[PDB]
Design a protein around this ligand. Structure first.
Ligand SMILES: Cc1cc2nc3c(=O)[nH]c(=O)nc-3n(C[C@H](O)[C@H](O)[C@H](O)COP(=O)(O)OP(=O)(O)OC[C@H]3O[C@@H](n4cnc5c(N)ncnc54)[C@H](O)[C@@H]3O)c2cc1C
Ligand SMILES: Cc1cc2nc3c(=O)[nH]c(=O)nc-3n(C[C@H](O)[C@H](O)[C@H](O)COP(=O)(O)OP(=O)(O)OC[C@H]3O[C@@H](n4cnc5c(N)ncnc54)[C@H](O)[C@@H]3O)c2cc1C
Ligand SMILES: COC1=C(OC)C(=O)C(CC=C(C)C)=C(C)C1=O
Ligand SMILES: COC1=C(OC)C(=O)C(CC=C(C)C)=C(C)C1=O
Ligand SMILES: COC1=C(OC)C(=O)C(CC=C(C)C)=C(C)C1=O
Ligand SMILES: [S]
Ligand SMILES: [S]
Ligand SMILES: [S]
Ligand SMILES: [S]
Lengths: 407, 406
């Protein structure tokens, strides 16, 4: 069997980041990354790509160029995990064994669970900022919008970046005002959830925007079918099972249902729901002490964001070092995550909170306000920090900055 | 390869029931059931077996004994579903094709997601009414109870028969009074949920029982580990991530986390959560119009019960007949389900409700009262009606009875 001291499953945000940090602990020759994609994407900027403010090409780089230098890139898909025997299977009919395993497989998009998708994306007026293949379609639907309903959805599953399905709604609204067709737009957000946002401070600031900008939100309403050729969409009322509703659209932004990666769903390392079952504070796996998890694929009960990955990578780095010398981990992840809620082409409400879903803000000012500074940070500084600091293993979240300020 | 007009996946409550109904529609020779288990169990009576009021031997019959005559029993496990090619795969490497598919694969028990199970069951004082292998350990733990915490758990997943985890707690409480050792038992229900029951009328009834009979209920508390050799159970506080609590027990009753069967989790027929993705009124699959689902494996947003299965079976029978006649289905399932809440060795609160979580009571009296009549119905009549009417395709729930009593 091919064998690595440290095996990292997934070469996305958590996976590259954890590889860089482990390369410094055990040497690069002893780290490997299993990743099928030829290309590594900074997904947060896709919100702005779909609103025409950023280029798609700049959001990605060849996976080879972000593999930490000297680390083995195994270009393949994980097809099975066998933790009892400290190995995994790949779709190249190889098995790979490990001393330590870091699982960073992200979340899976399930567009096909919506009847009429993904074939419906072939038609005009419909897009999705969650896929490299549909994010520019969001922008063409917005550009081409003439008059009628502009509908944005939120599915009945866990998602990554829970703020993004409404970020694109606020940008669309601002685009209609800037181009003079706001009066011809009936803007609707049909969300499976019960509330605009999970934290009251930001929910409240967001509700104010909902009222001032004449947006409609229907709660407990899930998209179940798209008829793209007829520009109609079908939603179920999650509160009155069996009741559906058909509604035409001049533009539709689909946030797809999401789920754990298929290979984890039935794996021994998953919990009952298919997420990687790790300790909530140390990210060490609950039942296999040499397995760890980070990011979207875990069952960490906080928002699934890259800011969370950043904050988790700093904890996991310590956890693994403590475990490597048969000691009890002591530093504890707090559930830190962040949500740069783009409310316009020049504003962001920067939500930050922890496991108790209470504000944990970095800056000494009220981040519940729409801010130019926070927009520039998301649009311009965060991509640079990601490529040049987070992926090199030098970004574990802004806790030190927060304590630096409050001083 | 082998092909059947109607292929039924699963030979449990809905599988056998649907195969019987379909035999009458397409003929026995055109129906097949894929089912691996040699034994078919009437699971509801395990609540009473765990309490030592019924025998485990009587809850099961050979699978061969309930297969409708003429209907092919394919003794195997489904390992793959390919609805785009109208076929499924089994674990003896056979491709089976169908004209229509009924999926009745049930719900999967995931004991091993509780750290320390299922190896913990080898130790005394721990049991589980949800498994043929542990229901009798419940009753052993109940009799052997001397003094301490009697702990009953409810997981953080969907479940079948959501009432059964408290049913055995009430039975245990009555047993302790009847054997003089009630003063020696601290009885605790540690549930992942935030409410005792989702229908307020029956939740208020159970709330009075809890208060009158000195039971503790701790909400948002989820069992995560058993240390059966030390008789300790670990709970997480769902309201404060990171917080846990280690409790000693003298008796522990585990309700295991549950999930869609593994073969369905990654299947095209599943919704994103892994449940069979069916129309909530017709039970026809949303995306594969020759696929249907019934029972615990579906995403029907009501309680996962045998009574729901029976009411579903009448609807699905009509849905499939109408489709075969090139008509559009019209008769609608209302979410009917029933929970015969055993509150003691002589009493049942018969909860009956629909999709809107509103009571939908068959009998003209108040079923939120503890009733002897309802206990005898659960303990003696329902098993009889199950084996001899429901599994033969002649029980579609009690809606006709309801209308007659009203
Ligand atoms: C539109 C959008 C906007 C967002 N905005 C923000 C934002 O403003 N702020 C923020 O903090 N976060 C944001 N996010 C979320 C952020 O992108 C993710 O949370 C982050 O990428 C999670 O990192 P990860 O490593 O867990 O998953 P990913 O970065 O997605 O990486 C997972 C990797 O695993 C690989 N993989 C999958 N299956 C297998 C397999 N079987 N074998 C091998 N490899 C496999 C995939 O190819 C992928 O490379 C946004 C996301 C989207 C979609
Ligand atoms: C302790 C207990 C008490 C209960 N009490 C009540 C009660 O009072 N009232 C009530 O209404 N309900 C009650 N129920 C619930 C009731 O038993 C179920 O809701 C009912 O059995 C659902 O039937 P089903 O066909 O959906 O699943 P099941 O009856 O479980 O049948 C599913 C079948 O699929 C088979 N199978 C699984 N995987 C595969 C595969 N890969 N390939 C092929 N076959 C497969 C299994 O072997 C099984 O035979 C109780 C359940 C329990 C556990
Ligand atoms: C349909 O979406 C809407 C809401 O949902 C969040 C509102 O609260 C409101 C505000 C209503 C009050 C009484 C503040 C409006 C006007 C609205 O359109
Ligand atoms: C790109 O993804 C993100 C991070 O990871 C690099 C962050 O650390 C943070 C937090 C950083 C600060 C300065 C609050 C945010 C908001 C974010 O969006
Ligand atoms: C065996 O499980 C059960 C059924 O399936 C046969 C029922 O139909 C019903 C409903 C039947 C009546 C007479 C209300 C109940 C309560 C039940 O527990
Ligand atoms: S986000
Ligand atoms: S977010
Ligand atoms: S039940
Ligand atoms: S129930």
């Amino acid at each position: 069997m091919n064998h690595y001291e440290v095996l990292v499953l997934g070469g996305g945000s958590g996976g590259i980041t954890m590889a860089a940090r482990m390369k410094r602990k055990v040497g690069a020759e002893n780290v490997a990354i299993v990743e099928p994609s030829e290309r590594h994407f900074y997904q947060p900027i896709w919100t702005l790509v779909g609103a025409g403010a950023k280029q798609l090409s700049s959001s990605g780089r060849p996976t080879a160029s972000v593999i930490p230098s000297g680390v083995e890139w195994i270009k393949a898909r994980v097809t099975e995990l066998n933790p009892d025997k400290n190995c995994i299977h790949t779709d190249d009919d190889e098995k790979i064994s490990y001393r330590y395993l870091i699982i960073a497989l992200g979340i899976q998009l399930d567009y096909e669970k919506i009847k009429g998708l993904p074939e419906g994306f072939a038609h005009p007026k419909i897009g999705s900022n969650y896929s490299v293949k549909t994010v520019e379609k969001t922008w063409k639907a917005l550009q081409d919008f003439k008059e009628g309903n502009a509908i944005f959805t939120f599915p009945n599953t866990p998602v990554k970046c829970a703020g993004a399905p409404q970020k694109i709604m606020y940008l669309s609204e601002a685009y209609f005002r800037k181009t003079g067709k706001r009066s011809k737009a009936n803007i609707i957000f049909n969300t499976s959830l019960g509330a605009i946002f999970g934290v009251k401070k930001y929910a409240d600031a967001l509700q104010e925007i909902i009222q001032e900008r004449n947006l409609t939100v229907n709660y407990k309403k899930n998209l179940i079918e798209v008829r793209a050729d007829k520009q109609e969409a079908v939603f179920e009322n999650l509160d009155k099972p069996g009741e559906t509703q058909v509604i035409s659209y001049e533009m539709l932004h689909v946030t797809p249902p999401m789920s754990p990666p298929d290979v984890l769903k039935t794996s021994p390392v998953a919990d009952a729901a298919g997420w990687v079952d790790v300790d909530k504070e140390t990210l060490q796996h609950r039942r296999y002490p040499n397995v760890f998890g980070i990011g979207d694929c875990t069952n960490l009960p906080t928002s699934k964001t890259a800011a969370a990955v950043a904050a988790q990578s700093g904890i996991l780095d310590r956890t693994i070092s403590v475990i490597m010398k048969n000691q009890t981990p002591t530093k504890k992840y707090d559930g830190y995550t962040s949500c740069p809620l783009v409310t316009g082409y020049n504003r962001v409400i920067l939500a930050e909170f922890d496991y108790k879903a209470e504000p944990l803000e970095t800056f000494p000012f009220d981040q519940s306000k729409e801010r130019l500074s926070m927009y520039l940070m998301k649009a311009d500084l965060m991509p640079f920090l990601y490529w040049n600091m987070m992926l090199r293993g030098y970004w574990g979240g802004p806790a030190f900055l927060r304590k630096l300020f409050h001083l």
